[PDB]
Design a protein around this ligand. Structure first.
Ligand SMILES: [Cl-]
Ligand SMILES: [Cl-]
Ligand SMILES: [Cl-]
Ligand SMILES: [Cl-]
Ligand SMILES: [Cl-]
Ligand SMILES: [Cl-]
Ligand SMILES: [Cl-]
Ligand code: NA
Ligand code: NA
Ligand SMILES: [Zn+2]
Ligand SMILES: [Zn+2]
Lengths: 382, 127, 382, 131
């Protein structure tokens, strides 16, 4: 039951990403799942595992009976919203590595843009937030961002440079909402305040759509249509005194310790260092937490992400090409799952913004929450 | 009316009496906030409260501009206050224009009536 | 390698009652700390947490209350009590792959004392509630009536399950029906709920919490108790699976998804039914115990009524069953307390220990995507 | 009560409001499916139509609810799993027969219930009237 390199992503499938799908969440899931299965050169009856998020409403049994996947030997969820995206692939790889399942589809599908909007601990956590009007994700993130600015001297233009590079990459991506619609830093600074220090263009929009990923053994993937995207690292992380988007009570709140914990495992599993990473897909539903991610993952020193970004390293021609699909900000907000698909494309060579040969891609999941990450890479050989 | 259950009701009951409290382990006396039934340091489920002095510093803050919130005049401020006791607390920050807030500034406790059945701690500049 | 790689080293529970007088989170924390202490470990040793999708005490709330701190593994399994054995599969998988070293599986609720969107799970109720088919007892009764038709089982055959459950509960000080055995006449005289189910075919709801500590088998050997090795751990969802209402299959009198669990358990463990020395068979309603015996190979199709009438579920019979009293007699903790009893049987510490028991088969919830375990004595002396 | 209707089952309740009992069918391979959903599990097509049931079937299973009381029903009441002549099955109420007279396999036929001014539902009654 060796995990690193034992499993690979062989198929990716998606619906169009839209602002009104006109159809049900289950239909979106079924479309993306069948697309991913076909992309892997497989048939629905080959699938014996399904993994999704706790909040996904298209349960495994409904996807399975609609698509003809039939019986399942593996079906699990990972919680905390977008924090789960890479964890779904970890689940799949673990089931493959242990022989529980041979073919696992990881999926997420929703109408978050167009869809109409107890006494347990999860509900009770809101008691510290809603009475004071701290009721949105942008506001929960802003509280961190303001402190990061204070400690390290980052400014709104530093956050803006993330939005600019995201939108530069989305502008050449036909699947991106903001295809052909780049922005300047001046556009970013002129955009209206949402919650200081976040402008409108620091925030992603909601999306409708579905995304799925097919995970098999590396041995099986070698017989399927595409270059295998091996899962060389796959990890979850939840930090000391972790809260849901509001871990404000730690000694320091300007890093993301749970992401550092993910990174430590990714590097240990894969045998890689930060210098070995050819590209990064960094979760960016809000721009400011991209900066501490770069630091937690060892690409630059604490407090110096602004400088790393200012030097051009996130560009397609830089030392860490980043969010080559446009990110959650520029392509679509499928709670991180479409970022994993772009990482697969980068390994395959098929990104719309392919920066050349890419051997290893690091992907992160949702920030501010218990989270996850992957390292996907080329087959190291047969 | 907030998301109140058996593990945080004490705090809002105290706030009703205009007392800002912090949960404390009865065994090892370590404070914790946000509250919960168990002490993560010693495992005891016995706890009591201490009343805060009413002083703190702005540790972080946000200024909400858009979209509109019904129960607030826009823009409004939410602060992460570090209490002198060492815990932190999210509340509103009043009595200061948003562009004048500085990280680290001293604040003192005040009390906001909000609906006739909910009383909440708020902070304002020490002065 | 998964089978035998991990073991249950600790069990912990609150009292099971009809009014805990405290929060679901407090119950979860109590059970989790009790299981950790039972394994001779400390909370800081824990790096994984697994629970049910519906459990309101999230992993992060349990962790920050108990001092578990950081986590490298946190997952959920859905479909209510179908999940109970799946949570242990999750933990065993995380241990076998090196993702986690110490995983706690838990469930806690106040189901006795405590108090719809556009998705597929919500929409499934459209086939049920408009017609008044609104309870789990009724959902089970639809299967039971057809099983009676096809095989000539009677209400008294279901009642024998209730009687043996209550016989074992009557000598279990932790059971709600301690010192309160029933007769088959009692069962037959109890009022109809939904034909063919009497009141005494149905378990009552409970307040309480249950936790289980999973570690590597090597680690368990240095902890206080005889390790309960996880020799089989499996999930199963069948063709055209629904949530409690899989009424559209060619045959509805078996439980194909439990057959699929059993096939994996036997293949993983290298065991046959004849090697199983006791069974913990999920019994929130009595009638589906009969097809469980058939799916798992302990008797022929349609002959569970004969297997039971011959006394095989008794302490002195071939397959001592539900020695704690079951969900029906001890407590309805959605199957988790049955896993604990299986651990006691392996340890030799059941209140109704049927002598030495090498291998124990445990099932999870019936009528739903489900799961199972084979727990076994340590196979040293190889 | 209003059923839990979404885009994938609205067609069936709309047909019921017109007193048509329908079964979803793959437009590509013509395989029936119930309960419904957006996709065909046999061929993968998302194109579908419906067939109207003949209105005949058999009691495949049933339950008799005695306790606890349901507000919308006189107790006891019967829910049947009806196997339609077309080969699919359907959960619905079985009216017009004392519970102790029900036999597995007995022929039943479609009738219509106005559960409220807003909701019409298919129900089944015995093909042989109970007098
Ligand atoms: Cl968020
Ligand atoms: Cl502005
Ligand atoms: Cl205010
Ligand atoms: Cl009676
Ligand atoms: Cl089949
Ligand atoms: Cl016997
Ligand atoms: Cl409904
Ligand atoms: Na399958
Ligand atoms: Na830990
Ligand atoms: Zn303490
Ligand atoms: Zn078809």
């Amino acid at each position: 039951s060796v995990l690193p390199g034992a499993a690979a992503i062989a198929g990716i499938g998606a619906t169009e990403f839209s602002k009104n799908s006109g159809r049900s969440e289950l239909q979106l899931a079924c479309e993306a799942v069948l697309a991913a299965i076909a992309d892997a050169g497989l048939e629905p009856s080959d699938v014996d595992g399904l993994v999704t998020f706790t909040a996904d409403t298209s349960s495994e049994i409904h996807v399975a009976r609609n698509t003809g996947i039939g019986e399942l030997k593996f079906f699990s969820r990972v919680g905390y919203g977008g924090g789960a995206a890479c964890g779904t692939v970890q689940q799949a790889a673990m089931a493959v590595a242990t022989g529980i399942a041979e073919v696992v589809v990881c999926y997420r599908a929703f109408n978050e843009r167009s869809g109409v909007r107890d006494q347990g601990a999860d509900s009770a956590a809101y008691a510290w937030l809603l009475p004071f009007g701290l009721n949105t994700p942008a506001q929960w993130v802003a509280m961190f961002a303001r402190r990061y600015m204070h400690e390290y001297g980052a400014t709104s233009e530093d956050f803006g440079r993330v939005a600019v590079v995201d939108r530069k990459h989305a502008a050449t991506n036909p699947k991106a909402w903001f295809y052909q619609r780049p922005i300047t830093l001046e556009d970013h600074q002129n955009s209206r305040w949402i919650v200081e220090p976040l402008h409108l263009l620091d925030c992603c929009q909601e999306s409708d759509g579905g995304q799925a990923l097919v995970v098999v053994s590396t041995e099986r993937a070698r017989d399927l249509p595409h270059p295998p995207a091996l899962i060389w690292g796959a990890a979850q992380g939840s930090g000391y005194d972790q809260h849901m988007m509001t871990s404000y009570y730690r000694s320091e709140i300007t890093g993301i310790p749970e992401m550092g914990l993910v990174g430590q495992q990714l590097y240990a599993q894969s045998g890689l260092n930060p210098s070995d990473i050819g590209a990064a897909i960094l979760y960016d539903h809000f721009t400011p937490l991209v900066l501490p991610q770069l630091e937690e993952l060892g690409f630059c020193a604490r407090g110096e992400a602004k400088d790393f970004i200012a030097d051009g390293n996130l560009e397609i021609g830089g030392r860490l090409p980043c969010n080559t699909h446009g990110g959650q900000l520029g392509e679509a907000y499928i709670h991180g799952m479409n970022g994993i698909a772009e990482a697969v494309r980068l390994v395959r060579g098929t990104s719309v913004n392919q920066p050349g040969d890419v051997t290893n891609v690091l992907v992160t999941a949702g920030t501010g929450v218990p989270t996850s990450g992957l390292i996907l890479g080329a087959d190291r050989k047969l | 009316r907030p998301a109140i259950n058996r593990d945080n009701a004490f705090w809002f009951e105290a706030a009703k009496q205009r007392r800002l409290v912090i949960q404390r382990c009865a065994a090892c006396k370590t404070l914790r906030h946000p509250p919960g039934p168990c002490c993560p340091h010693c495992g005891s489920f016995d706890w009591d409260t201490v009343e805060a002095a009413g002083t703190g510093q702005v540790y972080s803050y946000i200024v909400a501009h858009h979209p509109p919130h019904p129960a607030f005049e826009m823009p409004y401020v939410v602060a992460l206050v570090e209490l002198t006791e060492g815990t932190r607390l999210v509340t509103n920050l009043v009595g200061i224009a948003p562009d004048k807030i500085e990280i680290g500034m001293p604040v003192v406790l005040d009390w906001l009536e909000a609906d006739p059945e909910l009383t909440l701690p708020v902070f304002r500049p020490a002065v």
